[PDB]
């Protein structure tokens, strides 16, 4: 390209539990429509199968953010028409629903920071 492309992340939503497999639907459409070029990297919050280990206590919370996925990928009329045809997804996350508002690649990072902490110390 004649100006250098930029990668931008955004935000998708889809039903909890299905997040897993909304997230290979997209290498399927994106395989299929050849979009992989503009998906650089999605992330998965969630895993396709749970652990046996869960809170020590009932009154416990887990800081999980289920129904978000983060994926890095150029805002085009393709890609975004191509996600919405994507099964098991309520829209995208941004400034309205029509048009995902992008974000610092840092704090995508932030995002799945949050994953990875855990309570190590439950007060």
Same mark, same amino acid.
């Given at each position: 390209?004649? /100006?250098?492309?930029?990668?931008?992340?955004? !935000? &998708?939503?889809?039903?909890? #539990?299905?997040?897993?497999? !909304?997230?290979?639907? *997209?290498? @399927?459409?994106?395989? *299929?429509?050849?979009?992989?070029? *503009?998906?650089?990297? !999605?992330?998965?919050?969630?895993? /396709?199968?749970? @652990?046996?280990? #869960? #809170?020590?206590?009932?009154?416990? /919370?887990?800081?999980?953010?289920? #129904?978000?996925? +983060?994926?890095?990928? &150029?805002?085009?009329?393709?890609?975004?028409? *191509? &996600?919405?045809?994507?099964?098991?997804?309520?829209?995208?996350?941004?400034?309205?629903? $029509?048009?995902?508002?992008?974000?610092?690649?840092?704090?995508?990072?932030?995002?799945?920071?949050? +994953?990875?902490?855990?309570? $190590?110390?439950?007060?």
């Amino acid at each position: 390209m004649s /100006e250098a492309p930029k990668k931008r992340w955004y !935000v &998708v939503q889809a039903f909890s #539990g299905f997040e897993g497999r !909304v997230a290979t639907s *997209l290498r @399927e459409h994106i395989k *299929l429509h050849n979009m992989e070029d *503009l998906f650089g990297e !999605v992330m998965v919050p969630t895993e /396709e199968v749970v @652990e046996i280990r #869960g #809170g020590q206590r009932r009154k416990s /919370e887990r800081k999980f953010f289920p #129904g978000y996925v +983060l994926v890095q990928m &150029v805002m085009n009329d393709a890609s975004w028409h *191509l &996600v919405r045809s994507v099964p098991r997804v309520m829209g995208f996350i941004g400034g309205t629903s $029509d048009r995902p508002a992008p974000i610092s690649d840092k704090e995508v990072d932030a995002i799945m920071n949050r +994953l990875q902490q855990v309570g $190590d110390k439950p007060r």
